[PDB]
Design a protein around this ligand. Structure first.
Ligand SMILES: Cc1cc2nc3c(=O)[nH]c(=O)nc-3n(C[C@H](O)[C@H](O)[C@H](O)COP(=O)(O)O)c2cc1C
Ligand code: SF4
Ligand code: SF4
Ligand code: SF4
Ligand code: FES
Ligand code: FES
Ligand SMILES: [K+]
Lengths: 430, 44, 263, 213
C-alpha cells in the first residue's frame, strides 16, 4: 500500500482554480472539466451515484467528518408527498477556516454541479446554498455562475438534458457562527433565530420547511462531481484507509507564508507547514503549539506536532481532531493562555443562548479564562475549570458547547505549568 | 496562451449594493414553480 | 398491540410508540426533573434538567424530548444521571439572584425545590452575576427578569394557548432576554396563567405581591362562578382571609388554566 | 448594545419608512424562492434589504417587514436582535469591522486597530463626528490566511499594515472607492513569494474519466 502521504500532484488536484489565476466563469470551468458528461452521471441513477461516493470513502468536510455516502443515502427512499431539499452549508464560520470561501468565489461551477449531482442522488428538487452574509462579493460571484448554468440548460427544467428538474437558490446569512450548525442553519433559512433543533427528528426526515433534507458542506458537495467522473476508487487511492482523498488546508498564524493549499489526506503536519507555508516563523524550533482543525479542536504541543499526521483517525489519537483542517500555528512568542482566552471569548459571543450549559457555562468559562490570563486566580481553580467544561460537553443541544469545552481542555492538558506559573507571578505582586 | 500570473476574479470590484438581489430577480424567470403546504401560513 | 417494551431502572413498562423517556418514567411513578418541559406546551428541550442516562449509551439524552426505543433501560438514578443534574443546576444558579427572602416564589419554587433534591449543596461560582432590567407587561404580572432562567414556558404558552405572539427572546448567548422588545402589555384574558407556569419568581402576581408565603396558606378546593364554564379553583386563605385564587386541574373543564377574571 | 427598544423621536413606530417601488420587485423575487405557505422564510433577506435601502433598521422598518410577510412583529424583532449584521442604531457611512479573533490576533490585528483609532480619533464602538465612519471589532470573517484584515461595508481589505489601512481611510475620505483584496504582494490566498502548487496547466475536459462515463 501507500505508507507515506503528501506530495500530491496537480493532475490529481480537484480544485484546480484555488487561486483564481484562471477564469472562474462557465467558460473557464468547462475548459477545466466541469459540467462534463453531467448528463451521463444523472442518467446512471441515484444508487450508482451513492455507490461512487460510498466507495470513495468521502467524509464530511464541515468539521464532524461523517461518512458522506452513508449520510447521503438516508434520503434514498420513496417520497411521501413532501418535497426534498439539499442544503449546502457555506457558512464558513469556524475561526481559522477560509477554505470554502475560495471554492465559492473561484470554483463556483464545481459547487453548482455538485448541487445537481448530489441533489440527484438524494432525489431533491432544489438546493439552497446558505452563505454567510459577510461573503457578499463571493455570494454575488456564485449568483453569476448560477445564472450562467441556468442559461446554458445545465440546471433548471430538464437539467443537462437529463429530464430532471433542479433549482439552485442562494440565501445569505446575517452574522452568526451558530448558523453553520446544520439544524441552526435550517432554522435560519425558515426565517427564525439561528437556534439548533434537538435530534430526533433528523433532517433526513424533518428538515427545512419540515421536509426531508440533507445538509452538506461546500467542499463535500463540490468534490462529488469529480468523484463520479474519475471514480470513487481513484479518490480512495489517497490518504490512509478511512481517511480518503484530497483535503483543503488553511495554514495561518505564525508561519512565513500563510496560505490555502490542497494536499493529500494523512500528510504529516510538519511537512504541510514547511512544504507549503514556508515553515514556522523563527524556524521549526520556534513552534509552541498548533490548533489543527479550527478553534473547536484542542491544541497540541510541538512534541506531538513533530510526527502527527493530518487525518481524522491520526488526530483523534493525538487527543484532538481534524475538524475543518484549518491549521493555526503559534510560535513561542505567543501568550498561549491569552490566545485560547480569545477563543472562549469568541464562543461566548457566538453561543445562541438556547440551552443552559452553553448559555451560562461558556460565559462562566470566559470569566475564569480572563482571570487566568492575568493569573488572578488560585491553582485549585484549574481543576474547577476542567470540571466545568466537562459539564458543558455532552449536555448541550448542539456541538458548539463541545467546541467551547475542547479548547479549554487542550490548554489545561498541555499547558498547566504555564497557568500555575502565571498565578504565582500575580500573587507575588499582591 | 496559458497564463498563471494574473488574477482573473476582478469582476466583484464593480459590484454594488443591489448586485446580489438584482441577480436574484433575474433568476426568477428560470425557477420551477414552488411547492405548496396547502395554506397561506401555519396560522391559517 | 403496538406497545413496545422498555425498562426504567430495570423494571419493564409497556408504552405506545412515540412516548418520550420522560413519559415512560411517569408510568412507573418516577418524576424526572424538569424546567422547560410542560405537558400542555410544545416540547422545547432547552433547560437540559431532564438529562438521563440510557444504559450502554455513552451520551445522556433529554428525557422530555427523546422518544423511547424498544429495549431501552432508563437509569433515572445512575451516577451519570445525578452528575448531569448537578451540572445543569449549577449553571442555572450561577447567575440567579440571591432573592429568595424578597421573592414571592420562595416556598413554592421549583428552582429551590429541585436544587434541594437534585442539585449540590454549595457554590463554586466566584464571579459577578448578570443583571437584567425589568419590563412592564401590564398591571397583572410583575416581572423581575433577573430571576428568569430562560425556560421559554411563557413564550410557548402565549403563542400556543393564549394565541398571542408578543413574547419572545431578544439578543443571544448569556444576554438573551425574554420580553416584548418594545413596550407592550400582555393583556390576554388568559394572561395570568403565565404566573403559574413560570417556574421561578420572574413572573409573579402584582395583586398578591408580598402578602403571603405558600406554607402558611390553607387550600380550599372550590368552583369559579365568574362565568358558566365552572373552572375548578383553589382558594388560598390565611388567618380567615382570602389571599389568592389558583387553578385546579380538571381535564374535562379548565385543564390547569383560569381566566383573569377568575384569577 | 441594548436588546430592548425605547421609543425615541428619531426611532419610533411612526418614523417614516417604506420600500421603494423598485425594492418591492426585489422583495417579490425573494419571496418566490420559498415554498408557498412559508413566506416567513423571507424575513432575513427582506430585513437586510430594508437595511440596504435605509442604512439601518428603525423599529418602523421591522414593523413594515412584519406587515409585508404577515409575520408577528415580535418574530421580526427576534431576528433583528439575534443577527449581528443588522444595525438597530444608525452607523457611519463606512462601517469598519476589524477582525480580532485569534488567527488575526496572532498577525497583529491590534496594530491595525490602533492605527484606525489614531487616524479617526475615535474608540471602538463610536462614530466620527462627521458620521462618516463607525468602528467595531468582529469575530472571524473567514479570511484568516489573509490576516490582518478588515471589512468596510461589503468589501474585505486584507494583509493590512498600519500604513495600508491609513491609506484606505484617506481614500474613503476623499471619496474614491478603494479596490478590495490583499494590500501585500499577492492577489488572494496563494502562498506569498511563489505558488507551491497548481503551477501546471489545468487538465482539460474528459481527463482521467472512469470507463463507463
Ligand atoms: C457551532 C458550529 C458551527 C458549524 N459551522 C459549520 C460551517 O460553517 N460549515 C460547515 O460545513 N459545517 C459547520 N458545522 C458542522 C455542521 O453542523 C454539519 O456537521 C455539516 O454541515 C455537515 O456537512 P458535512 O457532512 O459535509 O460535514 C458547524 C457545527 C457547529 C456545531
Ligand atoms: S450549545 Fe450553545 S449554541 Fe448550541 S444550542 Fe446550546 S446554547 Fe445554542
Ligand atoms: S425564583 Fe426561587 S430560587 Fe430564585 S430567588 Fe425566587 S424563590 Fe429563590
Ligand atoms: S419568565 Fe419564567 S416562564 Fe418565562 S422564560 Fe423566564 S423563567 Fe421561563
Ligand atoms: S425539561 Fe427537558 S430540557 Fe428542559
Ligand atoms: S481570525 Fe480574522 S478572518 Fe478569521
Ligand atoms: K412563577
Amino acid at each position: 500500500k501507500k505508507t507515506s502521504f503528501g506530495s500530491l500532484k496537480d493532475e490529481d488536484r480537484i480544485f484546480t482554480n484555488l487561486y483564481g489565476r484562471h477564469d472562474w466563469r462557465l467558460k473557464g470551468a468547462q475548459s477545466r472539466g466541469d459540467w462534463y458528461k453531467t448528463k451521463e452521471i444523472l442518467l446512471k441513477g441515484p444508487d450508482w451515484i451513492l455507490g461512487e461516493v460510498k466507495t470513495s470513502g468521502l467524509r464530511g468536510r464541515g468539521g464532524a467528518g461523517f461518512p458522506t455516502g452513508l449520510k447521503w443515502s438516508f434520503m434514498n427512499k420513496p417520497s411521501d408527498g413532501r418535497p426534498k431539499y439539499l442544503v449546502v452549508n457555506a457558512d464558513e464560520g469556524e475561526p481559522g477556516t477560509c477554505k470554502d470561501r475560495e471554492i465559492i468565489r473561484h470554483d463556483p461551477h464545481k459547487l453548482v454541479e455538485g448541487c445537481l449531482v448530489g441533489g440527484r442522488a438524494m432525489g431533491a428538487r432544489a438546493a439552497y446554498i446558505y452563505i454567510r452574509g459577510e461573503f457578499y462579493n463571493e455570494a454575488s460571484n456564485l449568483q453569476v455562475a448560477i445564472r450562467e448554468a441556468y442559461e446554458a440548460g445545465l440546471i433548471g427544467k430538464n437539467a443537462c438534458g437529463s429530464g430532471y428538474d433542479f433549482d439552485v437558490f442562494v440565501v445569505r446569512g446575517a452574522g452568526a457562527y451558530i448558523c453553520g450548525e446544520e439544524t441552526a442553519l435550517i432554522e435560519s433559512i425558515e426565517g427564525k433565530q439561528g437556534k439548533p433543533r434537538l435530534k430526533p427528528p433528523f433532517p433526513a426526515d424533518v428538515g427545512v420547511f419540515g421536509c426531508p433534507t440533507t445538509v452538506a458542506n461546500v467542499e463535500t458537495v463540490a468534490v462529488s462531481p469529480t468523484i463520479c467522473r474519475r471514480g470513487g476508487a481513484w479518490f480512495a487511492s489517497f490518504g490512509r484507509e478511512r481517511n480518503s482523498g484530497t483535503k483543503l488546508f488553511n495554514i495561518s498564524g505564525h508561519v512565513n507564508n500563510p496560505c490555502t493549499v490542497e494536499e493529500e489526506m494523512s500528510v504529516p503536519l510538519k511537512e504541510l507547514i514547511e512544504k507549503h507555508a514556508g515553515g514556522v516563523t523563527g524556524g521549526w524550533d520556534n513552534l509552541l503549539a498548533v490548533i489543527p482543525g479550527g478553534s473547536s479542536t484542542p491544541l497540541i504541543p510541538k512534541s506531538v506536532c513533530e510526527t502527527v499526521l493530518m487525518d481524522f483517525d491520526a488526530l483523534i489519537q493525538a487527543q484532538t481532531g481534524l475538524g475543518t483542517a484549518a491549521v493555526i500555528v503559534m510560535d513561542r512568542s505567543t501568550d498561549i493562555v491569552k490566545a485560547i482566552a480569545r477563543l472562549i471569548e469568541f464562543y461566548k459571543h457566538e453561543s445562541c443562548g438556547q440551552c443552559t450549559p452553553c448559555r451560562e457555562g461558556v460565559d462562566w468559562m470566559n470569566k475564569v479564562m480572563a482571570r487566568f490570563v492575568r493569573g488572578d486566580a488560585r491553582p485549585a481553580e484549574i481543576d474547577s475549570l476542567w470540571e466545568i467544561s466537562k459539564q458543558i460537553e455532552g449536555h448541550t443541544i448542539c456541538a458548539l458547547g463541545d467546541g467551547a469545552a475542547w479548547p479549554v481542555q487542550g490548554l489545561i492538558r498541555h499547558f498547566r505549568p504555564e497557568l500555575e506559573e502565571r498565578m504565582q507571578q500575580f500573587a507575588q505582586q499582591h | 496562451p496559458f497564463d498563471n500570473t494574473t488574477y482573473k476574479n476582478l469582476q466583484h470590484h464593480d459590484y454594488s449594493t443591489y448586485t446580489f438581489l438584482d441577480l436574484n430577480l433575474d433568476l426568477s424567470k428560470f425557477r420551477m414553480p414552488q411547492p405548496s403546504s396547502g395554506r397561506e401560513s401555519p396560522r391559517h | 398491540s403496538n406497545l413496545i417494551e422498555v425498562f426504567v431502572d430495570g423494571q419493564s413498562v409497556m408504552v405506545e410508540p412515540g412516548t418520550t423517556v420522560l413519559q415512560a418514567c411517569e408510568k412507573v411513578g418516577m418524576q424526572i426533573p424538569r424546567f422547560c418541559y410542560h405537558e400542555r406546551l410544545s416540547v422545547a428541550g432547552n433547560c437540559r434538567m431532564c438529562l438521563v442516562e440510557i444504559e450502554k449509551a455513552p451520551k445522556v439524552v433529554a428525557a422530555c424530548a427523546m422518544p423511547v426505543m424498544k429495549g431501552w433501560n432508563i437509569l433515572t438514578n445512575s451516577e451519570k444521571t445525578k452528575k448531569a443534574r448537578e451540572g445543569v443546576m449549577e449553571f442555572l444558579l450561577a447567575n440567579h439572584p440571591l432573592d429568595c427572602p424578597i421573592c414571592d416564589q420562595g416556598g413554592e419554587c421549583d428552582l429551590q425545590d429541585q436544587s434541594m433534591m437534585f442539585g449540590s449543596d454549595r457554590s463554586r461560582f466566584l464571579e459577578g452575576k448578570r443583571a437584567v432590567e425589568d419590563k412592564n407587561i401590564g398591571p397583572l404580572v410583575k416581572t423581575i427578569m433577573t430571576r428568569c432562567i430562560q425556560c421559554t414556558r411563557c413564550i410557548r404558552f402565549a403563542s400556543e394557548i393564549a394565541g398571542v405572539d408578543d413574547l419572545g427572546t431578544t439578543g443571544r448567548g448569556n444576554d438573551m432576554q425574554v420580553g416584548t422588545y418594545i413596550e407592550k402589555m400582555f393583556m390576554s384574558e388568559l394572561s395570568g396563567n403565565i404566573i403559574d407556569i413560570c417556574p421561578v419568581g420572574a413572573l409573579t402576581s402584582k395583586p398578591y405581591a408580598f402578602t403571603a408565603r405558600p406554607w402558611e396558606t390553607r387550600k380550599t378546593e372550590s368552583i369559579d362562578v365568574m362565568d358558566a364554564v365552572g373552572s375548578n379553583i383553589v382558594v388560598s386563605t390565611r388567618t380567615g382571609e382570602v389571599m389568592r385564587i389558583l387553578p385546579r386541574m380538571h381535564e374535562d373543564i379548565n385543564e390547569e388554566w383560569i381566566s383573569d377574571k377568575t384569577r | 448594545a441594548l436588546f430592548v427598544h425605547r421609543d425615541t423621536p428619531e426611532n419610533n413606530p411612526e418614523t417614516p419608512f417604506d420600500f421603494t417601488p423598485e425594492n418591492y420587485k426585489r422583495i417579490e423575487a425573494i419571496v418566490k424562492n420559498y415554498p408557498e405557505g412559508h413566506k416567513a422564510a423571507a424575513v432575513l433577506p427582506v430585513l437586510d434589504l430594508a437595511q440596504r435601502q435605509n442604512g439601518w433598521l428603525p423599529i418602523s422598518a421591522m414593523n413594515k417587514v412584519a406587515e409585508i410577510l404577515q409575520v408577528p412583529p415580535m418574530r421580526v424583532y427576534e431576528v433583528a436582535t439575534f443577527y449581528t449584521m443588522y444595525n438597530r442604531k444608525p452607523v457611519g457611512k463606512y462601517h469598519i469591522q476589524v477582525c480580532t479573533t485569534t488567527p488575526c490576533m496572532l498577525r497583529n490585528s491590534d496594530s491595525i486597530l490602533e492605527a484606525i483609532q489614531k487616524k479617526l480619533g475615535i474608540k471602538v464602538g463610536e462614530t466620527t463626528p462627521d458620521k462618516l465612519f463607525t468602528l467595531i471589532e468582529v469575530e472571524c470573517l473567514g479570511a484568516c490566511v489573509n490576516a490582518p484584515m478588515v471589512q468596510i461595508n461589503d468589501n474585505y481589505y486584507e494583509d493590512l499594515t498600519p500604513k495600508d489601512i491609513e491609506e484606505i481611510i484617506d481614500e474613503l475620505k476623499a471619496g474614491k472607492i478603494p479596490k478590495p483584496g490583499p494590500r501585500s504582494g499577492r492577489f488572494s490566498c496563494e502562498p506569498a513569494g511563489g505558488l507551491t502548487s497548481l503551477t501546471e496547466p489545468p487538465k482539460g475536459p474528459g481527463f482521467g474519466v472512469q470507463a463507463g462515463l
